[PDB]
């Protein structure tokens, strides 16, 4: 059984601005919704904030040297909107843009492909004060923001993502309130989802006007498997599937909103103008998949609003975030996505990884994380199987390069293949990182 | 409005060798400045700290002067050699007793004593053992700190370890304009490292035997762009690294600035991992000494930073040749707030200006309108900094008294209280009167 | 009749190192064959040399400001091999490379696209002492030189030329001896042509291995028109055409060498190994055309070696270099070139312009060159006509930005749209430059 990957298959690792950078309001940087959210008591585990995080804003050079040691060919990162445009619209912050300028140049000098994400959940607070994702004008705001980047990094950043995981943004930020801006409303959730999609479309159009390279969205998908042969459980499964996996992909593919949403959101559901769906379906060049696990939903009449709940799969290992370890579901999902996009849209796994307990400090210069190593090897093999089934998969980014702030769960959830001692900011490459470096070097042959 | 936050602490600052006099009195040991000032050519007009403001004898009068100024805090330094004549070993009872009387007297007046362990006056006996080039000083200093920590436990609650490491090393070891007067990049690098280590050791000792809050005091001189030429920007970063980041960065656990490798060349050294662990020992507060900014340009022959300031002729300059530019204070405070992550309480431990005053009062008065101007504009700049979110807890004017400006002698007057050095007569300047009103109205006078 | 040019059509101007730089052996720079050639009595008109020229090595910043005043979107320039690698092989000269580093950064800062040429006739003398273009190893030497540039300017210089005018290099340098290195030999001409082609191929391969962007060769073409209906005149035309226009193009297109060359060079003609032609035909991304005029050849039995000679076309104006002004022949050539390359290869006019008399100094701050203006307007119109006929033309470079050293003809031939007072180095923009600036600004609409 060989596991060598296709020619040009791109290996990398991924991060997000608020999760690693720190210095969030430093050097002209504006206030974001997470600056506010994280400094409100009760919102974050242990009261953790992104004020310091991995101190990447100051230590990015060391981090690039770590990327080189891991033999990374690509680095997927996000740009903080509020760092570049403090009020979201209007005046640009030179020092903030200069940071990403230095960063990208440092990456290109290192021979590492910069993969940029425009929006990774850190909306400028000034725009939130204007309604945020509930305000349709954001479609323009986002576009303008996008333009600033497109022209600044023209010819340097060739691969662009617009939005990272619309579902987490809306479901977490507007439906249940576990993420910034911390609203809890189905009425708001429907609107927010729609305007996120519109914003994506607007950004793609603007990219066609002033940009260079390839642009696409990044979706998270969590495949829903049958819990039983009861029809109510299958209806539950389809509700969960529609709300999480089809909500955004379907209108992006020109199929409109899933009908089940009408049942999920009830009186909060809306019909939107026809031209909106034209904007939303703006042709893209590639698509990113963020993937971690599957779920096995059963009927749950009291679970708002999908009336479903996952059944614990005790036969398999679970991560520190409680996600089942089940690699075949990655293969299936990739196939499924290939099918939903007609096989014509180039795909990339922009996030995949696992959280396990690591000590807060290295132990004789090492971090032994055999379960993360196992997750890594089995899921990369699953990628190979998906490619063997005809999926046009061009690359793979491990989440994450560094142990970082796992948003509302704080620093307790370590996804890094590089350990960060948050007391000292010292980095230590984990066994998982060493092994991933081996996977890249052999282009997969080490899995043989 | 310019009313300051509740509990905001107003005061003035001094240093031992600059005001005390009686350097060899009552058991007091010899310091490096006793030697330095009595070597011809080192000091302007041959000035020494032998008499200075005679504060050792007139401290009560000086405290009454503090009361007339409505001071809520007094920042001062303790002479190491006055307390421990050989730097190590036997304590000098009378010398320590001076500071005992002083601190008790301050507390009687309702004035908070802010004590600095080291303000440039190393015991000469330790200098003969290598001074700041000897790593053992980290321990020596710690022991010295302990003596004070236990003696003034519960009375002095706010402690500074070292005052301006950059001036100590750059002036004392790199260029030799200050005691002990060495000129060596090699020694400068080693000395800087041992100064930081000594700070760390003193903080640990404070954790074990001390009570209250402890921190270091850094001077910062923000470096602004001279042009858009890239060599001038590289120059700017060399200067900034050598002066402003050399000490702050390792204190915040980020190691030494990369640029230093370029600045010091073959004189730069790698140090053991545990040293930086000692150096970044967590502090409770930080002092900023601030006076001005600089606008560095490339200067290949300027050793060792290869940079030089461009004279900013659009603005007023002090008698020490420092540009008057209050906005740079605001910026610096913000910058400092960001470098320390906002978690560390900041205090302006020194700010002020030197202008010419006559050697005597004029019908009971000293009119210093430019010092008044410096004061009001920079205090307003403090208010602006607080408005931008800086956790700034207080402000100490340099200086309470006209004093010995080290190698520049008595020619540079920084006092808000005038000292006639012929008669030791004190006269409160217009700047002092105004500062007293700033304190009493808690800033409202600035409206 | 509109003359708006295609979207993205690139307007610029061109120079060559020895023709403008001066400071030829300054800052570590090595001796080139033109250093030797120009300082040998009898070789150059009026004893002119490239010692000072336009003093561009010292005044490049002023020249960039001049480019900005002309609204240039691109600047085509060459890199002096001996300035960067003094002995042609071995140690790099840091100051020499630093000059082009500063130049390129300055160009990019001004928003001007740097178009770099590896070889513009100035071979390092040390390599000439090893046989120059007669030594097959030059293919390797050139490649190594190319690499130095490819990596130094990776991501900054995106458009690369390998060789500027193989025909002038070989015919002028080795066949007739009018150009450096001043050899006169058909045997040497055949060998040199072959090795120039090989060097191009080697540089393209090396570029594929370590470079980034688009790379191609630059050919001059002088279309040969019928003088009469006499068959010997048509045979003459075909000889001249084969020797000048098809000699290099055909093997570059994989068609081997023109059959007629066997007749032109006789006993000096040679057969070369088959793999050489695999190397020569290495796929390129674009091709440059240098174009000035046409010829009308007739039979001339005593003319060595093509046995042909041009018939003076007295019905048309001639430039000071004695070249007929006939704009339709430009259109024809482009079409011809489009046909020879199958329409698949993006083309750019890398040189076009004319030499007319100008005074040595400005006349009240002006230089009135109405014939150069005329040449410019008619030939640019001819470009538009060529595009209408299906030529995939992406850009146009005026030769030249500056009055410069016209090689063996010295400073007597002014090609600049910017006048250079060679006594004072004062630059004065000519009426032609003013007009060209308006052409760029209106993207061709001024021609309407
Ligand atoms: O939950 C772990 C990770 O999930 C991903 O889908 C998000 O993009 C990350 O920001 C997050 O850290
Ligand atoms: O130059 C004026 C003052 O600068 C301060 O930073 C030093 O601590 C003083 O000793 C000195 O007198
Ligand atoms: O012969 C005139 C011109 O011919 C061009 O094709 C060359 O590139 C130039 O260097 C030269 O000035």
Describe the SSE topology.
The structure is cut from a larger assembly and holds three copies of chain A.
Chain A: E1 10-14, H1 17-20, H2 33-38, H3 56-69, E2 74-78, H4 81-84, H5 94-109, E3 113-119, H6 125-128, H7 138-152, E4 159-164, H8 166-175, H9 186-210, E5 214-220, H10 231-246, H11 249-252, H12 260-265, H13 274-280, E6 287-290, E7 297-299, E8 308-310, H14 328-340, E9 347-352, H15 370-388, E10 393-399, E11 418-420, E12 427-429, H16 431-441
Parallel strand pairs in A: 1-2, 1-10, 2-3, 3-4, 4-5, 5-6, 6-9, 9-10
Antiparallel strand pairs in A: 7-8, 11-12
The complex binds beta-D-glucopyranose (3 copies).
PDB class: hydrolase
Keywords: TIM-barrel fold, hydrolase
Entry title: The M3 mutant structure of Bgl6
Architecture overview:
The PDB classes it as hydrolase. By secondary structure, chain A is an alpha/beta fold. Chain A has an eight-stranded parallel β-barrel with strand order 1-2-3-4-5-6-9-10, surrounded by five helices. The first copy, chain A, has a two-stranded antiparallel ribbon with strand order 7-8. In chain A, helix 15 packs parallel to helix 16. Chain A is globular. Chains in contact: A-B. At the A-B interface, loops of A face loops of B. The complex binds beta-D-glucopyranose (3 copies). One beta-D-glucopyranose binds next to loops of chain B.
Got a strand count of chain A? 12
Amino- and carboxy-terminal Cα gap of chain A: 6 Å
Largest sheet of chain A: 8 strands, parallel, barrel
Biggest sheet of chain A, strands in spatial order? 1-2-3-4-5-6-9-10
What pair of chains forms the biggest interface?
A-B, 11 and 5 residues
Just give the CATH class of chain A.
Alpha Beta
Strand content of chain A: 5-15%
CATH structural architecture of chain A: Alpha-Beta Barrel
- Which secondary-structure class do the elements of chain A indicate? alpha/beta
* Estimated radius of gyration of chain A: 21 Å
What oligomeric state do these chains adopt? part of a larger assembly
Going by CATH, the homologous superfamily of chain A would be Glycosidases
Question: How much helicity do the residues of chain A have?
Answer: 25-40%
SSE order of chain A:
EHHHEHHEHHEHHEHHHHEEEHEHEEEH
CATH topology of chain A: TIM Barrel
Tell the overall outline of chain A. globular
The number of helical segments of chain A is 16
PDB class: hydrolase
Keywords: TIM-barrel fold, hydrolase
Entry title: The M3 mutant structure of Bgl6
Chains A, B, C: Beta-glucosidase
């Amino acid at each position: 059984r060989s596991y060598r990957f296709p020619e040009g298959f791109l290996w990398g690792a991924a991060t997000a601005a608020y999760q690693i950078e720190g210095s969030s309001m430093a050097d002209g940087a504006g206030e974001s919704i997470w600056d506010r959210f994280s400094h409100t008591p009760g919102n974050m585990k242990d009261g953790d904030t992104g004020d310091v995080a991995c101190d990447h804003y100051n230590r990015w050079r060391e981090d690039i040297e770590l990327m080189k040691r891991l033999n990374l060919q690509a680095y997927r990162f996000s740009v903080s909107w509020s760092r570049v445009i403090p009020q979201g619209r209007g005046a640009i912050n030179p020092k903030g843009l200069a940071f990403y300028d230095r960063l990208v140049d440092g990456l290109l000098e290192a021979g590492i492909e910069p993969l940029a994400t425009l929006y990774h959940w850190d909306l400028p607070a000034a725009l939130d004060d204007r309604g945020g994702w509930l305000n349709p004008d954001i479609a323009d705001w986002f576009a303008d923001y996008g333009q600033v980047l497109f022209e600044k990094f023209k010819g340097r950043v060739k691969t662009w993502g617009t939005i990272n995981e619309p579902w987490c943004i809306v479901d977490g930020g507007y439906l249940h309130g576990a993420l910034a801006p911390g609203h809890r409303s189905a009425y708001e959730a429907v609107i927010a989802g729609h305007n996120v999609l519109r914003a994506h479309g607007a950004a793609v159009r603007r990219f066609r006007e002033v940009g260079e390279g390839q642009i696409g969205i990044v979706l998270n998908i969590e495949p829903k498997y049958p819990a039983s042969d009861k029809p109510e459980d299958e209806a539950a499964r389809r509700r969960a599937e529609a709300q999480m996996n089809r909500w955004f992909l379907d209108p992006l593919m020109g199929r409109g909103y899933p009908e089940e949403l009408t049942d999920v959101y009830g009186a909060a559901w809306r019909e939107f103008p026809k031209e909106d769906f034209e904007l939303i379906a703006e042709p893209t060049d590639w698509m990113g998949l963020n993937w971690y696990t599957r779920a096995v939903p059963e009927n749950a009449p009291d679970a708002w609003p999908t009336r479903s709940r996952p059944v614990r799969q005790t036969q398999h290992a679970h991560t520190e975030t409680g996600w089942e370890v089940y690699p075949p579901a990655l293969t299936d999902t990739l196939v499924w996505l290939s099918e939903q996009t007609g096989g014509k849209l180039p795909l990339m796994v922009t996030e995949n990884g696992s959280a396990w307990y690591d000590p807060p400090h290295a132990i004789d210069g090492r971090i032994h994380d055999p379960m993360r190593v196992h997750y890594l090897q089995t899921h990369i093999k699953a990628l190979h199987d998906a490619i063997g089934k005809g999926v046009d998969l061009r690359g793979y980014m491990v989440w994450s390069l560094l142990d970082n702030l796992e948003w509302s769960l704080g620093y307790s959830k370590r996804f890094g293949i590089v350990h960060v001692n948050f007391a000292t900011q010292e980095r230590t490459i984990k066994d998982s990182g060493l092994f991933y470096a081996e996977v890249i070097k052999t282009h997969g042959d080490v899995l043989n």
